[PDB]
Design a protein around this ligand. Sequence first.
Ligand SMILES: [Cl-]
Ligand SMILES: [Cl-]
Ligand SMILES: [Cl-]
Ligand SMILES: [Cl-]
Ligand SMILES: [Cl-]
Ligand SMILES: [Cl-]
Lengths: 390, 391, 388, 389
Amino acid sequence: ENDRAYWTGLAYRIAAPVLENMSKGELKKNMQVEVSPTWDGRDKDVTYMECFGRLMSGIAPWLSLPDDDTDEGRQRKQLRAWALKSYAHAVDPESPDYLLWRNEGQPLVDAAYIASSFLRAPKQLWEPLDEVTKERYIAEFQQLRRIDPPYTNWLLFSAMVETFLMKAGAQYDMYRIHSAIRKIDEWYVGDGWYSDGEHFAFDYYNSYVIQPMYVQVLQVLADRDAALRDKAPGAVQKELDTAKKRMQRFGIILERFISPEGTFPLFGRSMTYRLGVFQPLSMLSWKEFLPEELTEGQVRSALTAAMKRLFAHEANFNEGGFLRLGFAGHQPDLADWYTNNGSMYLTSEVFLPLGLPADHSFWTSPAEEWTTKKAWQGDPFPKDHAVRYL
Amino acid sequence: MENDRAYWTGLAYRIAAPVLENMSKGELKKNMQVEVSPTWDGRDKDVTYMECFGRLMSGIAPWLSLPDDDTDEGRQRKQLRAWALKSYAHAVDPESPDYLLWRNEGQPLVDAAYIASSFLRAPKQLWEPLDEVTKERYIAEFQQLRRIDPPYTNWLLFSAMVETFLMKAGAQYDMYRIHSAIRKIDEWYVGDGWYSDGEHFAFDYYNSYVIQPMYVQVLQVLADRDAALRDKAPGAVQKELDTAKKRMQRFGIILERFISPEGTFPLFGRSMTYRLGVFQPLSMLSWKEFLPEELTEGQVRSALTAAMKRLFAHEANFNEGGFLRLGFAGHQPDLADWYTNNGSMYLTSEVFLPLGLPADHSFWTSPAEEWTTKKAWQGDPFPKDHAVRYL
Amino acid sequence: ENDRAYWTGLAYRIAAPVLENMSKGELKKNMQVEVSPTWDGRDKDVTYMECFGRLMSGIAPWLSLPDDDTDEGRQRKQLRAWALKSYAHAVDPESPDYLLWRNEGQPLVDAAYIASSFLRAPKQLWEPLDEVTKERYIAEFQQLRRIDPPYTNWLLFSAMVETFLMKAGAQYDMYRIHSAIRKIDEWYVGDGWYSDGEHFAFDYYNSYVIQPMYVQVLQVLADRDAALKAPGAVQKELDTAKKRMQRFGIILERFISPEGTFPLFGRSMTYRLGVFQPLSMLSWKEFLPEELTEGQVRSALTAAMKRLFAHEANFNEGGFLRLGFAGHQPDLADWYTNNGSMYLTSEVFLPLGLPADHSFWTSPAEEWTTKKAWQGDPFPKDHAVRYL
Amino acid sequence: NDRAYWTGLAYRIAAPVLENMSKGELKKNMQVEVSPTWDGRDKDVTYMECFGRLMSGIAPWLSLPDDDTDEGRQRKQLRAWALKSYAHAVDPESPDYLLWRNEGQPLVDAAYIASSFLRAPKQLWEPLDEVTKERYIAEFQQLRRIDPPYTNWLLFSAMVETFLMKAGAQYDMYRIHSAIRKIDEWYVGDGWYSDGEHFAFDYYNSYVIQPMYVQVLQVLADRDAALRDKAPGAVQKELDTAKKRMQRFGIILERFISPEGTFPLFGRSMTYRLGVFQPLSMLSWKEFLPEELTEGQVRSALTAAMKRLFAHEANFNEGGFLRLGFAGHQPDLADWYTNNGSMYLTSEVFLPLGLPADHSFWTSPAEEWTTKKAWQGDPFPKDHAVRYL
Ligand SMILES: [Cl-]
Ligand SMILES: [Cl-]
Ligand SMILES: [Cl-]
Ligand SMILES: [Cl-]
Ligand SMILES: [Cl-]
Ligand SMILES: [Cl-]
């Protein structure tokens, strides 16, 4: 009935076919796999890490909740138990579900989403892994340094992996972290927007990667008081504060993109990532730093409306229960040359505020009308203003 | 049933007629029900009338540039044009009750640029028929605006537009104002169809309200005249115009992808009270017939019509006198910025540019088509979008 | 005997053939004129405004001094008397020495140097002109708005002319001033250096034009702001511009070798001691940074001046400057260069605008940086200024 | 015979270092001096600064084939000492084991060691025994612990990894690629780069930036390294541009030399003496002087500057080591990070000794340099910006 029940129902529906199969080493065996009509010929086994890593990144906050014996609590325990077995299989070289770690550049991407999952729920998803599994993750993450990343948002993947290694107490490469955060800052364009590399692209990679991962990296550096070369006293915290303020502005923009009937603009590449476009707004919500311009109720209501409208299309799922290539249903020609149905699991990134308890104000507060909904009703709605000075 | 044009001309007439009928007889200030922002900064309220008239004429000038005919629409065009010609004369006659506020404030540079836009968009129909005394008055009023030192923002284009008009009119003009402006606008291109409104990027619709339409219009006149600009070789101005057009084509693709299946669009940035003025680039691409291959005329007409019908279904957009009110969808006065009055609202006229294509043009007669988001949310095929990174 | 006497002797030698001839409308008649071997074919009459304007810009501070009846005082009076008549001829359409105001783009350049002369000595060079002459200057300066300048240091020429018009109480174009100062600031590269337009060039146009004119324009704007309102942002801009020029001055002093030479790079190397205009301006306006003493600056500049102007071939038979650097080196002249252009070397003379009994002139000689260094003596570490 | 002056000076600088280090007595015997404003770091950094900077500058000279001339005898002696020195430098049991494992400064001087190996691989790297080679590889690799300043130091990391790549060891392409991107981004124009995000008017363009950028790109181009999102020919184009920029900087440096063999003193680290001419020396050694510069004029100008600066006996201490200063002993000129080992960057002027004694660079007639012609009142060329790079 309540918005939360819709969200947990959908998250469970997305997660369960992946995790139940992978928990017993049958993901590759059973997963109905689909590649772009313009697939560039790369090894199709990249699909499984895309699927698993992107999924776990998005549902890790949910699974970080304390255990209880409610219906939702039982689902969380089941998903988490499956996930823990899945993590073990993913790095066991003898498992049928051993992921493609050692070839291709793409694993850096999806390993960063795995790292995200551990950073978002360390006590629940990392700490319970056995020591052999932990050692395997450390080794698999470290060997990704073989990849020379594109000079784009991919720099954050390298930073995320090394940040995880740092936090896990393993040997890490600070240069990869520091070089990345410098470039991301250099790529800030203004009024909440970053360039995806040296040239500005009007697309949702600000949501898919840039702002959420930049904030996450800076948060770990700030929390550890990591000694960064030529950072004055307070400087890392100041960088984090600026990053958060920029993402707050981007969140205001994203909420104003949601139409009265729960749609949003479709532009830029990787439009098949569906509700992944809202990761910044979901992150602001989960971490409880929505700007004063946005109430929890309005954000929950707008995101729910968008989610219900998009996932009313049954053709988003195939017979096996896996996500298909598309946006609203099955639209395979929308898939870029680098896209497979594992890639689709980036849509899980909308679910971050499920990491707030069921009795948190985000979930229990009254529904509110979002900006465009008010506007087209002819009702008062707020003026918007640019944020410079960031 | 299937006549989008009739909806557009009906709305444009409804917006234009109360302004032009009153101003044609020097009674705009007498009769216009005027409204200022709740946070009005205290400037002289007479700025309202130039905002109203200038912004209106900019948007309907293409429509009124059509050849005369004796259809119902043709009769409306003749009536509007006759009123407009008398209005232009009153606007610069120092003895007219409707003499505009030319000589005080900075704001007149803004709205004079929209007047200049109207003359550049329909020179034969709106400029040439003015009597010689009126023309000389415009030239003098435009020239004295050089007293204004503009903000280092989109306002540079206002100065450029006025000077470009003066150049085209055969008057004394200041090439430095034109050239410095076009250099800055180019320097402010950020990428993938977007410019900064000055040195700092703002995510708002000023790319639509001012920057891209006026940049393209200035470059078009310079290219057409083969104007000798410092260190621009033969063909160099045309190359700048080609780039400007390509950037605006990309911005047009973005704007079409902003239109929701139910005819709404995102609301962000300042001056959201400009309503359908957000679509000026798409309307300009349509009118000047350089929509990129990604966009069909039918899909653009259909999407714009849907947005227009939905927004102007709100009766509260108009007051008792027939003038636009402060708001977006209806009367939402607190949306008005400190610099906004109900004359400012007439920038919504900038959607009407493709009315300058004849009624029997393919833009108007082609079958309706579904726009991008409408296809997408139906679960139907819709195109991949791609950044344009090379401009 | 003293350094000052060398400087005034040279300034007089440079100035007198120009001003004596032009004062009686015989500059074009008598001036032995020389153009670049690669002269681009423009009207050669540009030469006379280049000569007169660049000269007056550089000697205006000297001639701004109060009168006295010393030998130097007599030279100042004579030069000023000739200059006043010359200014009148320059804008009288019936004079044989009427300058080329109305055609070409080059007049914007040299008109800016004329404007500089009036801004640097208004009471002595502008105010005594008769009303008809003043009206003619205002009209001639205003019609230069016909020129669409290169997107380079030339923006400052337009700014300088309009700044003069503003100061003179005439109709002026603030947009020309403001757009120029914005671009110049945008073209600051760092550590005292600006780009000459959108592309950095390693040359002395920072000295010839950019920093001295940027500072002068800002100073007038700041003085007008201060005469009103709460301190404006223009004061901060002027402060930054001065600090940048202080750093550039430190760099210029470190360019002077122990034997009074300096590096030769970039275009317009025929401008000779014009390379030192920022250092001369810092000295005249008394804001040398603490790193530089007046004595060391005077000593270094004198050494450079004596060595360069020991070459007799710098002057032709008529007493006019020739194309070259140290002597007659005509192939050094760019396609836009004539011997009138050479008078930009007058810009070294700015500290002659300080009285003969000022500390700049009376303080003990001091060793300059490289002179100390190559003696094996202590000399200061240099530091980048990265915060401007 | 300009060459004999150069080899005499290079030998005088090199021999006290290499003879002592060859027998593990550099730390024992070297008369060491730190800045009056020394920041308190471990003074053992001095020895790697000394050895690495020395070897970088004389490596071209020592790359020449052996012969039976007087100079040939000196080269053989220096090279034999250097080979023993390289072995001691990485032997953890040697008294002269360098400070590899602590401080950030070792990244700097290890890059100069790597430079020496890249400049003379057959003569200085290949003859090292396999244990010594393995030790170098390990010592270079562990420098990845250092998070470099966002400055010219990025090239040190690139240089080390480039050496590792060329040596056939495990290398980090990310360190190389990120560095070359930043250096290109820091090009300001007309031959000048910024030392990091803010332009500094100083000679770090000479000490580090242009010579190391060109060297890194040259190895990448020669190997035909497949770099991320660099199309075929992209690396070659970057190398070509880098060389053209350094040609312009070389023209500028030649025009800095006064008629009496001085040059401007500006920016930090002015104690590096003739290290300011490394780009001009490199252009000469690698034979890509631009047409504006003849070998004769460059040799003559550099010789004049070198003779005038090293006429000051106080440049050397009693032990024969360089002292803190510029022209003599001027210790207050030393920055807080400077010791007398740092001074050995002045060896970077010697690169064209890597051209044989019978090469045109050495045998061509002396020519007058630009300022010398200018102040004589003689014709000299117009200079022009290169704005298109
Ligand atoms: Cl990507
Ligand atoms: Cl939706
Ligand atoms: Cl505005
Ligand atoms: Cl010039
Ligand atoms: Cl120069
Ligand atoms: Cl350094």
